[PDB]
Every structure is written in structure tokens, then in C-alpha cells.
Amino acid sequence: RIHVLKNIHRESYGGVTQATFLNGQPIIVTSGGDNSLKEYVFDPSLSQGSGDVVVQPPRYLRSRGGHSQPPSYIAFADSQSHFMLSASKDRSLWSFSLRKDAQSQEMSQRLHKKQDGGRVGGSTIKSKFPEIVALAIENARIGEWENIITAHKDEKFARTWDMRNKRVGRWTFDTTDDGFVKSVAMSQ
Amino acid sequence: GPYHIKYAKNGTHLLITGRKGHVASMDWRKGQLRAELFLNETCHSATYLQNEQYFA
Amino acid sequence: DEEDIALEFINGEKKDKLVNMNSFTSMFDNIQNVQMDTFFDRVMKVLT
Amino acid sequence: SSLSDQLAQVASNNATVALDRKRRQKLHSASLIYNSKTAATQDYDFIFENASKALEELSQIEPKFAIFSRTLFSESSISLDRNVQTKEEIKDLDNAINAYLLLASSKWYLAPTLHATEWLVRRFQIHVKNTEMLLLSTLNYYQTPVFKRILSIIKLPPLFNCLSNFVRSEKPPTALTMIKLFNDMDFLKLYTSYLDQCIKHNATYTNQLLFTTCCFINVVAFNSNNDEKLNQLVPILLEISAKLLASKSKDCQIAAHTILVVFATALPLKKTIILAAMETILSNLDAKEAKHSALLTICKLFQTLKGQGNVDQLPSKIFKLFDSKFDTVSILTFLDKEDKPVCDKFITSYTRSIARYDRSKLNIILSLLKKIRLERYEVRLIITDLIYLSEILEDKSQLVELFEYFISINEDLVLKCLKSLGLTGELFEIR
Amino acid sequence: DESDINALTKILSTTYNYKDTLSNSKLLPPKKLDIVRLKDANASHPSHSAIQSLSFHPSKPLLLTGGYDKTLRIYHIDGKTNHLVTSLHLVGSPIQTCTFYTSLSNQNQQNIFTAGRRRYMHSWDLSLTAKIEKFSRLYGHESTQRSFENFKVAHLQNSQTNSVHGIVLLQGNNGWINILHSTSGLWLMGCKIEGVITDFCIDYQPISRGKFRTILIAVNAYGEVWEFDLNKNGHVIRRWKDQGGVGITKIQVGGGTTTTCPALQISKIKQNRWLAVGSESGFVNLYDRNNAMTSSTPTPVAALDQLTTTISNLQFSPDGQILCMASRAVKDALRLVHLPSCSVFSNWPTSGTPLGKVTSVAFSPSGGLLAVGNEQGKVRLWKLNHY
Amino acid sequence: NPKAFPLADAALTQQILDVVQQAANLRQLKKGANEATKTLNRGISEFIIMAADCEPIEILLHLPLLCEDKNVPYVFVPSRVALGRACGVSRPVIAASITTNDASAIKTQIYAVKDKIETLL
Amino acid sequence: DSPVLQSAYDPSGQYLCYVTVALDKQRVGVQPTQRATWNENFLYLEDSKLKVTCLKWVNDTVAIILGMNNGEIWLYSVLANEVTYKFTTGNSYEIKDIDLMGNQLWCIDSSDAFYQFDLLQFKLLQHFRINNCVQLN
Amino acid sequence: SLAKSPASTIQILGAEKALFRALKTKHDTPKYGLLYHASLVGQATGKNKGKIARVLAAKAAVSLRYDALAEDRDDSGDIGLESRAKVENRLSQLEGRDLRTT
RNA sequence: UAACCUGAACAGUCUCAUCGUGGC
């Protein structure tokens, strides 16, 4: 048994639904019911004499994907109707392209560093943010600082995001009255 | 660009020219290149003179 | 009394030696022309 | 990619072809005996004739080199150039070189093998073409100047990357460097394939088995604190344990015993894996030192076994196989040793398998559990299946005297098991 | 090539996991814990002081916290929402030790005994107004007991009837332990050790059906340990010496019924297997009382040295497989040492565990659940997934 | 061990190890046999504590021989493990010299323990 | 948030059944809604991860059916303190809802399956599943 | 008189003029002395021959004052042999390390 | 009666050490 790629697709959406080798090629395309299509490639062997017994494990290559759950919120990122921000119940914020579907990219949730230098809390096993109730994007100062302000399900602070970097921001705005965020806005 | 090829008169050295600017003189049968110069105007052709030591 | 049986089962457990990073680093010095059964009991002395 | 990268690839392909005098000198001065200024002036006839002398010496020491005198050391091979024949002739002579190297891996302490493989280094360029097999064959000799010499002249493979600060150095690689070399996974797959060819062609020698087992148990020791690396590592070293147990050498069998005992005490393996491991241990047990190591190995592998199901009766096939390899006198004697091994859970499983599968040898289980002391759950399960033995078959003096032993010690416990199932007056009326 | 001694190869080619699965383990794996963090137990209602003592209920899901702000709070704990059951503020009486007592006869009393640096000790009778009584009479022995701080509650049998009653045990000045009734407050007996009494613990051992025996185990500062049989008159049965150990702060037993893992039913009383003597340098000797009740200079099975300042808590988990060393002197000084292997778990606590300055610790009797109270006034709560 | 003269009883060894612990907190002791003999040579030791627990005791019983030349008090305690705990290191300590000081906070405790030592000489 | 995880009245609103956590294990208790007509004993779920997903009062030995998260419907009498009968499906899927009409119990599964049980016969009568209904709760 | 000297003195015992010039001006003292010609220090190489000159002087102080101060001594080399085993495996564990990165 | 020691008893207005720089 060469290798096992575990959790290559979600079991709840069907597992790996079709996997096929492109023939003559060391690349295999998988697709699952979680709205995802991946490719995995076999690199050539690392031993220069044996080869057939030292099989390097398959690594990841390109993939396309979308939301695995129906989206819960929708906004347009700019006045040109090129990108649109889209948040789903599977707790991901995607930025989908209306012009060319290769440009669709998941906004990353990799947090910044704390401003003073203290530790940030949270679980070690990183999971995605609670699913997005509302959002408000105003790209007047885009690239300059935080640009999207978003409000999640049953939590008392609103995160920010940067659409230029396509990532989370440094700030989570609290409500200061122990109430969940019911709306967000931002000025132009 | 498209590469004009040229060999030395004994087959030891190879001289390639890109159409864009990339001229490389090399020992194609070892792995030794001895000139890789990017002359950013459109080059057309090259040749060795009497050696791998000079090329036009 | 299944809790009492479970407590006597976890009570009849004896202290063992665990493998460290460096429980076997000092064997290369004396793997020279000794026999393999002497190596086996030299390992078993480390494990016990 | 870039042009200098693609040209480095074509240099690495054309590494061995001498395309002028300076490359021929730099490429022919790589000797294993002489220094560069002598080695560059030597011929093929000179190094061939004294390598043929050394192969005659090596062949009268060990007579399996005569066919290498027929093919690899013949006089057609003076003019045989390596990089002028096709891939099929290349793979023919490269498994010829692999055969010579894993035959002469054992002989590396005596100078005829140095002067003989000098000709493989200088004619067939095996320091740069067949280099992985050369390193893997002489890996044992790493404190020695012959491994210093092959490291000085070698071109190092990408799997052997940590030896790159010990090439052209005056000090030998250290043991921690050897464990860092073995700690990779692709290197572990490479070395286990090398051992598979060794075990297949019957060339495993005891210095190699010692070095291999030392580096393996140090890999397990280094990875003893990350379970995902141990779990990546289990079907490699247990596979090589199966392939060492599936051979005839007592030395390689107890090498596999060492690997199995360290690996089972490093992580708690599955019960069925431990049982199949003891089946593979017993299925080829022929020696005596192998029997000593096999009994100690099966005892520790059953000791390192937790949960509901540690001390069941081991099944009928494996129990009668363990009987055919180890009878009663062997088990009783080994328990009577004053060094006191820890044989608790295995001896409990053994006596319960006797009570389910033999039903004649109960005086011996009285004597052996008189010898060694057990725990409360062990003797509780023993007396429960003795109670079931009394209720299935008629209760004679051997079962009666067993219950006299279980009355003479810990009578409250046998009362507790009878009250959990049965009655004391009813059991005394039974027997 | 082929169509379809190989037992190991076949079992490896079929298996994919290679370790014990979930519940066919029944005893803890060493060196790697499995411990999730729950909601902080006193997060619902904050504490106004360092949390000086902490005890779970023997049966109910209740956690009693208490500290120098002279109030004691009971929390219904669960995973999500640890709420506050009730809360009683004793004015002018800062509390230092607070214990759920639950008798063995009817298991229906549910007293809370609490005490601080005072010449009295309160006893709240749990009734879900609040009826509390005050013990303030040492019946002739007030000179040798000037502060009710260090008490422990235990069970005692009459040994001519099979009638048990609770005793509280007060650690006094000279070497004295004053044992007195937990309902009437009558001074029953006293046990004097020779030196500076620093700590003590209670061991029980069964004798027959329905009879057990209570042993008080009291340690000098120097390291010498007295064991008093006190189901008879409080007379010494064993006197031994701790190997090493010069400033001795805390002794504990474990592996059976301690005062912190209490038995609900008299037939469920067990003999303790382990005994840990933790010292001022952070050294914790560990003795195995399945063989170390005979030697009279017994050697420890291991001396742990992992945390370097003064041992102020050391508690055994109810199964008796983890010991918890803890120090209130520096921050984050808590270790969980697995035993019998006597090896500290290396994956918890990490550098980011919000342990704080650990000034109390408690183990749940059923759930497998740590509560750790620090000097900021926070009980943090963890669940061990082996249980 | 028989040849470990004056050995302390429990009360004297408890107060010896108490003054060792507070001298270790005041950084006023030299722990180890070689450092004890260095303080013996330099004449800056108040008294020497040794352990009657080392398996060769002859690695110890040489600093008595230059204690009785400089008439500095010396004493034996029964446990090298407990002496190491008192000195406040993680290793067993075989001998320890409490060094001299005249502005020391624990000067009175050092003097009381050394008088109790030189009563039994 | 509330500690009471599940709760339901009997018909006529005379008793309240309620599932709360008790130090990592679920417990099911019944209280009378007026004392003028405590109840200190609970059903204890003995596993730390087995939990009640739904509950329904039956209507005459009075009982609760507790739909668990391991493909079981426990049937638990309240005057006594044991689960009297353990209905089980063939699976391990948590069950999202139950109901009953008379003696005929019906239940839905996390694999969107319908099961029918008979309280008078203690048997799984029917098992089926229907198209385009795929997230039933 | 050699037995009642500390192990640091037994380390530097031969190198008195280098020692006292390197103390009377504030320089770095020698590390070998007369003990440099021991076979173990010969086996060491680098700065760890200073290191095992130190550990060899420590174990040599142990063995030397055992020999001078024992009365039930047996002339059989037992304490010196266990001390030599300690020094040899210490020399092994600091010749096994290497300052290179592999 | 006291003195002294001692329990987690310096340190957010951060405390302390050491080497320097400029003017305690």
C-alpha cells in the first residue's frame, strides 16, 4: 500500500465520488459532492537507483472549488461588477469572479498578530468562524486598511477583512453591551 | 522568442539566440554554459568566429 | 461490583520503563563483533 | 525552469563521460587505493591485473567470486565501456554490480576486497553510477577509513543528504548522524528494500544485523514522542520484521525479535497484530538462541497489551503451534529462572488456553502458577474458567487440587467468584 | 506473475490503524494526555479573591469554591453553562478550606464544612435561609488549637457497633491533630507527632464485611511520618521516614478512597495504593503502599522533580492513575504525572494553558474532570476524555 | 556508616538543614566537596556539613583532616539526598560549606547551629 | 444560555420531563408542575457521549420515549427508574425526531430514513426513505 | 597531600607558571596541567579535552582520596575502574555530538 | 509581654542587574 490521502473530500457530502488517473500521467483528478474538484500528482522517485520501491507520496496540485453549503450572504465587491463576496453556512467567505471563474478565491482566515504582543486565545484545533449573518464592504480606502466588516452568528463581535489581500483583518469590533451583532455598516 | 540555433564547427559548443534578447553560448554536451547574456533588443542570429571564445 | 472489578484490573498494573529519545544511543559503541543474542539481552536490559 | 537548471540536469546525465583530457583526469583520479597523482597516471591494465590478483585471493577466501571473474572481472571488461551500451545492457551490468556489492559487503575488513572493488570504481564508475548500493552495502563500516575513502570519492545521493558535511573530512560520521540518516521515511523504504535483497540472496551477516537493528531501534526511540510518526513507521519496520523472521538465519531472526520487542514497548499495537506477530515468530523457529529470544519476545509482546481482552485464551491454532515449539518443560524451566522476567499476562493467557484446549495438563499449570505470582484479575479469570471446567466435565483430583491451591491462597477471592456465579456448598457438593 | 509465516504481512495489509481503538484500553496511555477545555466554572459569577479551596460533590454535579473574600459559592457544573446554584457570604470569616461531607449511613446529610484563620469552623447543612452551625469549642483543648485552617473530614467506625460517623481533623500547633465529631463537635481524640506538623491525610483499610479502619497519616516538617490507628484509641501503629525530603509541605494518598474521592457506600471503601510526599524544593517522593507498608525505611518508587518551587497541592485522580502536582508560588506550575509509570505527561499543560498561579485543584469523582483555581479568582475547567 | 564522626540526631539535623536552606537563599553556601575544601583552604567557611550516605565515604573523610587544622566545626547528616534538597539543587550534595559573613541576616542562626555543633565537636 | 437541553410537558401539562447535563452525562428527570395535587431521582445516561436528541410523552403506564443519538429510542417509565425497552434501528445514525399515534411510533433518521415501530409489539415494522427530502429534522 | 587537594588543583597541577601568570595579570588560565598526558585526554579532541580534563580530574580526585584515605582497601582497582567507566561514557557522549548541522 | 523568623509578601506609575553615554 503506497499511501492514503485521508479526508480528501467530505464524507457527509458523499466522500470521493469520482477519482481518475489522466492516462499516461502521474496526476489523478478527484471530485466530491462537496462542490470541489482536485488534482494530485506523483513526483518522480527520490532514490536514483531503486525508484519502484521508494514511491514518493502523492502531493496536491491545482484544484477548483466553491461553497459546500448554500450561501448565506452576498455582496458585490466593487462598482465594476467583477468580484462578489459570498458567505456560506459552511463558514467560509469566498470571493467569486463574474468574469473568469479561475479568479474565484477563498478569503483566508489566518489571523494577524496581536497589537500589543500578548497571546490570542481560541482553540488550538483551528476551525472556521461562525457563519456570517451580515457584511458591509466599502472599497474607498482599499489596500490602505481593513475594508470589509462582517457579523457572525451568535457572537458578540464583528470581524474585519481586507479584500485587497483577501484575508482577515486585525480588528474585531466589540458591541460593549453583551449583545450579539445584528447589523453592520461602514461609511464611504 | 524563437531560438536561432548555431553549433561550433566541431560540435562542442552551442549558441542559441532568442528573438527577444536571450543569447546563450554553452557546452551542450557537458552542462557548462559560458555566456548567458540578455540583450534586451531583438536579436536575429549569431555565429561563432573561430572558436567558442568569440561569437558575433 | 463491576466497578470493583475494573478497579482491581487497573490496580494490577506494574511500573514499566518507557522508551526515551536516548534510551538506545549508547549501543553503537558495543555492537562491534558481539553476538546478536548478546545484543538482544542488552536491549532487554534497557527495556526492563 | 531556467537554462542553468536544465544544463545542470544535462551535466548530471553526462557526469561519467570524459569529453576532454581535464575531465578524464579529474574523473580517473578518483581512486580507492592511491592518491590522485598516482591514480591519474595509472592504466586500465595495471589496475585490472592487481584487481584480478585480489579477486583470486577473495575467491579462495569465499568461493562465490568466481563467477564475477567469469563476467565482471574478465578480460573483455578491460575494453567494455559503460556508457556506450544501451539501457538493457546497463541494467544487466548494474545488477551484476549489485550482486558483487551485496556479496562483498561482509568482506570489507580485508584488503583484497578493497583492491578488487577498486576496479569497479575505476572501470565501471560505480562511485557515481551505482552509488546508492555502494553506500547501503558499506554503511556498517562508518567508523572505518574505508567508509571515509568512499565518502571522499563518492557523489552523494539525495537520500543520503546528512552525510554531506562528512565528505572530504578527517573525522568519521557519528552515531547520531547515522540515526539522523535512518530517521527518514524514504530512506527507511530504501534500506528495507536493500535488506529484502540481502535476505533473498542469503547474505545477511551478523555485523550488518547488529548495525541495522541498532539504527532501527534508535529511529523508534527518536520517534517515540510523536504517534503520527510512529504510525507512519509501523508498516515499514513490522514488514521488515516479517521478512527477517521469514528467513533461516538465527541472527536475523533475533534481530527481528529485537525490532519487534522495542516496537511493541514503544507503542501499544493491536491485539491481532501482536497475535499474528507471534504466529510469524513461531512459524520458522528452528534455532536455540532464537528460541530464547522468541520466548522473551512473546512474553514482552503480551505484557504490552492493554484493555478488555489482554488475557483471553490465545486461540487453538496459535496455542498448539506454541505447544509444538515450546513444550511444558521449557515454559516451567524458564519461569524457574532467578532473573525473574515479567511473564504475567502471557502466562495467564497460556493457562487459560490450556484449560480451554488441553484439559489433561492441569498439574503443570498448578506447578507453574505456584512458581510465579499473578495479579487479582489474572487469578480471578483463571478460577472462573476452572469453575466452568468443573461444570462442563467431571471434576477429578487435578481440578480438586487446583482448587485446594486457590483455597490455600486467596480463599476470599474464590468465594467472591463463586458468589458471583454459584455457591460454596453447591461447589463442595460438586467436588 | 501471481493470482490470489505470512500472518504478520497479512494483518498489516488489512489493518489501517495500528493501536487500541477506543474503549478496549480501560487504563490511561502514558506521555500524551487527552484533555479538552470546558467553560471556566466560576465564569458565571466571578470571585472577589484568590480561590483557596475547591471541592466537588461526591454524587451531585456541584463544585464548591471558596477564598479569602469570606464567601463560598456552589456551581452546577456541566460542559457549556456552569451556573451558580447558591452562594453564602459569611461575614468576618475568610475561608481557607471547604469540604463537601456526605455520610456513609444514609448518604443524605450533605454538609459543607468550612474554615479559615479563626477559632471556629462553620458547618452548613444543605437543604436547597440556610441552616449553618458553628463549631467553636475544643472540649478542654483550646490551647493546642488556635486556628481551624487546616482541617480534613473523614469517616470513622465505632468498632463495637457498625455505626459510622464523620470526624473533622484539625491540625494544631505542637504536633497535635485534634479529631472531633462532625455533628456534635465533641473532641474524640488527639494524636501528637514529634516535630512541626505540616500536613496529614486519611487512609482507610477494609477488614471484613462492613468494617473498615481509619488511619491518620501525619508528617513532620523534617520528613518522618506517623501512622495512627484511630478507629481504636488514637495509637501509633507505624512510624517511618521519607527518603530524602527536608522541607515537607504536603502528603496525599490515592488510588482508593481519599477525602477528595470519597466512598458513597461503606462496602465501596478501598485501600489506597499510592502515597505522595511533596516538598519545599518541588520534589515529590512517590511510595507504593502495596509493598511500602512493611519496610519502615521505604524507598520511593520515583522522586519527581519537574516543578521547582514549593509543592502546595498534590491530588490523586479517583482511579488513582494521575497525580497532580501544583505550586502556588510561580505561574503555571502544575503537572499531571501518570502512574504506575511515574512519568509526566509531556503534551499538557503547554505554554498557553491559562493555569495562572495555581492555588487550588480538584478532581471530579465521576466525570474525569479537573478544576484549577488560580490567584486571579478563576476556576478553569478541563475534561479528561479517557473517562 | 561507622567512620562518620559526629553524626547529628533528628532535631539538630533539622535545624542544620534549616540554616542550610536559608543560607542557600542568601547565596552563602558552597555546595559540593571540592568547593567545601576550597573554602577550607581559604579560611572563609563557618562550618562544614557532610553526608554519611556516600558509598565511598573516603571521598569525604579528608576534609575533616583539614577541618581539625583550622579548628572549623564539621558535622555529618545522614542523607545526601536531603542535603541536596536543602541546598536547593536537583542533585544529591555530598558536602556543603556555609561561608562567612558579618552583615548576614542569618548570622545569629549560623552561630547558634555552629555552637550546637561544637558541643559535640 | 439554559442548562435544560430538552424539555416537554405531558398532555394536560401536569408533569415536565427535562434532560440536563450533570458533570458530562445526560440526565432525564420528571417534575410535577404543581406540588399541590421534589422528585430527586433521575435517569442517568451512563455514557459521556450518548445524549438525548428528542423526547415524547406516551399516553396507561406513563412513560417517555427518548430518541438518542445512536439509532435508539429508549422507552423509560417514570414511576420506576429504568428504560423498560430499547428500540433500535439497524444503524448508528442519530435520530432527529419521533412521534406516536396511539401505539404506532414513527421516527426520522439523520440519513433521512423513516422508521416505524409498534409499541404494542416492540418491533420495527417499516423502514423506507423517499426522494427529494434529504435534510429532515 | 595530593588527596586533600580539590579536583581543580588536580586538573591544573602541572601548569603552575602559566596559571599564576594568568592570574597575576587578568588572563585566561590553562586547562590541562600535568593531566594532559592521560590516555583519555589523548582520546579527546578539541575543546572537549579541556572538558574531560575537568571530569578526569574530578574522578581522579575521587579515586585518589579513596586510595589515600581508605582502610579496607583491596588493591583491586574497583573504584578507579567504575570511575573510568564513568569518564569513558562521558567522553563517548561528548564525542558523539557534533557542532555541524546535518 | 516582647523581639526575631516564617506561609504564594519587590515589580504597570513595570522592578532589578550590568556595561556605556550626557549632565544625584
Q: Do chains F and E touch (3 or more CB pairs under 8 A)?
A: yes
Q: Domains of chain F by range and CATH?
A: 1-121 (3.30.1330.30)
For A44-73, b/e burial (b = at least 16 CB within 10 A) is: ebbbebbeeebbbebeeeeeebbbbeebbb
CA-nearest of A51, A86, A52 to A69 is A86
- How is H25-91 classified by DSSP, letter by letter? TT-PPPS-GGGGGSHHHHH--SSHHHHHHHHHHHHHHHHHHHHHH-SS--SS-HHHHHHHHHHHHHH
Is E319 an 8 Å CB contact of chain C? Answer: yes
Cβ separation of E81 and G3 shorter than 8 Å?
Answer: yes
Please check whether residue D407 is in contact with residue D376, taking contact to mean a CB–CB distance below 8 angstroms: no
How close D185 comes to chain A (CA, Å)? 9
For residue E366, list chain G residues with Cβ-Cβ distance below 8 A: 23, 25
**Does residue D12 come out as left (phi exceeding 0), alpha (psi in the -120 to 50 range) or beta?**
alpha
CA–CA distance, B29 with D11 (Å, rounded to integer): 8
Least CA distance to E353: which residue of chain A? A121
Is A182 an 8 Å CB contact of chain E? Answer: no
- Chain I positions with any atom < 7 A from a protein CB: 5-9
In angstroms, the CA of E252 and the C1' of I5 are apart by 28
For E140-152, b/e burial (b = at least 16 CB within 10 A) is: eeeebbebbbbbb
In angstroms, the CA of H21 and the C1' of I22 are apart by 39
The single residue listed with the C-alpha cell 607558571 is H17
Q: Which residues touch strand I (CB under 7 A)?
A: E 50, 52, 249, 310, 312, 328-329, 357, 359, 375; F 22, 105
Please check whether residue E89 is in contact with residue E122, taking contact to mean a CB–CB distance below 8 angstroms: no
CA–CA distance, D291 with D324 (Å, rounded to integer): 12
SS3 content of chain F, % helix, strand, coil (to 5): 45, 15, 40
Please check whether residue C24 is in contact with residue D217, taking contact to mean a CB–CB distance below 8 angstroms: yes
Please check whether residue E5 is in contact with residue D245, taking contact to mean a CB–CB distance below 8 angstroms: yes
How close D76 comes to chain B (CA, Å)? 28
Cβ separation of F59 and H8 shorter than 8 Å?
Answer: no
* D21 to D18, D29, D81, D160: CA distances (angstroms): 7, 12, 17, 31
3-state secondary structure of E378: coil
* Phi and psi angles of residue D163, each rounded to the nearest 5 degrees, phi first: -85, 10
CA–CA distance, A119 with A129 (Å, rounded to integer): 19
CA-nearest of E267, E301, E305 to E283 is E305
In angstroms, the CA of D90 and the C1' of I12 are apart by 76
For residue D11, list chain B residues with Cβ-Cβ distance below 8 A: 30-32
Please give the order of strands across the beta sheet that includes E164-171: E151-157, E164-171, E176-181, E187-192
Whether the link from the prior residue into E349 is cis, omega within 30° of 0, is: yes
CA–CA distance, G42 with G19 (Å, rounded to integer): 9
> Which of C3, C7, C18 is the closest to E341 by Cβ?
C18
How close G112 comes to chain E (CA, Å)? 28
CA-nearest of E320, E344, E381, E283 to E82 is E381
CA–CA distance, G128 with G112 (Å, rounded to integer): 9
Q: Which nucleotide is nearest to E327 (CA to C1')?
A: I8
Start-end of H helices in chain E: 7-14
Residue nearest to nucleotide I8 (CA to C1'): E329
Please check whether residue E7 is in contact with residue E351, taking contact to mean a CB–CB distance below 8 angstroms: no
Start-end of H helices in chain F: 10-25, 33-42, 63-67, 80-87, 107-119
Q: Which nucleotide is nearest to E310 (CA to C1')?
A: I8
β-strands F74-77, F45-51 pairing: parallel
CA–CA distance, D191 with A50 (Å, rounded to integer): 10
CA–CA distance, D337 with D296 (Å, rounded to integer): 12
Method by which the coordinates were obtained:
cryo-EM
> Residue H97 corresponds to which cell in the numbers above?
555530538
CA-nearest of E387, E306, E382, E374 to E345 is E306
Q: Do chains C and D touch (3 or more CB pairs under 8 A)?
A: yes
For D86-114, b/e burial (b = at least 16 CB within 10 A) is: eeeeeeebbebbbbbbbbbbbbbeeebbb
In angstroms, the CA of A118 and the C1' of I12 are apart by 15
Q: Residues with Cβ < 8 Å from A27, sequence gap 6 or more?
A: A21, A39, A40, A41, A42, A61
* Phi and psi angles of residue D142, each rounded to the nearest 5 degrees, phi first: -70, -20
Residues in chain G: 137
For residue H92, list chain C residues with Cβ-Cβ distance below 8 A: 26, 29
> Residue B49 corresponds to which cell in the numbers above?
568566429
Whether the link from the prior residue into D145 is cis, omega within 30° of 0, is: no
CA–CA distance, A161 with A75 (Å, rounded to integer): 14
Start-end of H helices in D130-185: 131-137, 145-153, 175-182
Cβ separation of A50 and D130 shorter than 8 Å?
Answer: no
For residue C44, list chain D residues with Cβ-Cβ distance below 8 A: 261, 296, 300
Q: How many CB pairs under 8 A join C and D?
A: 96
Cβ separation of E16 and A119 shorter than 8 Å?
Answer: no
Cβ separation of E246 and F90 shorter than 8 Å?
Answer: no
In angstroms, the CA of E310 and the C1' of I9 are apart by 15
Q: Do chains G and H touch (3 or more CB pairs under 8 A)?
A: no
CA–CA distance, B35 with D96 (Å, rounded to integer): 42
Q: Which nucleotide is nearest to E328 (CA to C1')?
A: I8
* B15 to A53, B24, D199: CA distances (angstroms): 41, 6, 53
* E302 to E274, E338, E339, E340: CA distances (angstroms): 11, 12, 10, 10
CA–CA distance, D300 with D322 (Å, rounded to integer): 15
CA–CA distance, E153 with E101 (Å, rounded to integer): 7
For residue E281, list chain F residues with Cβ-Cβ distance below 8 A: 85, 88
Q: Residues with Cβ < 8 Å from E344, sequence gap 6 or more?
A: E304, E306, E335, E336, E337, E338
Sign of the CA dihedral with D5 first, then D9, D12, and D14 last: negative
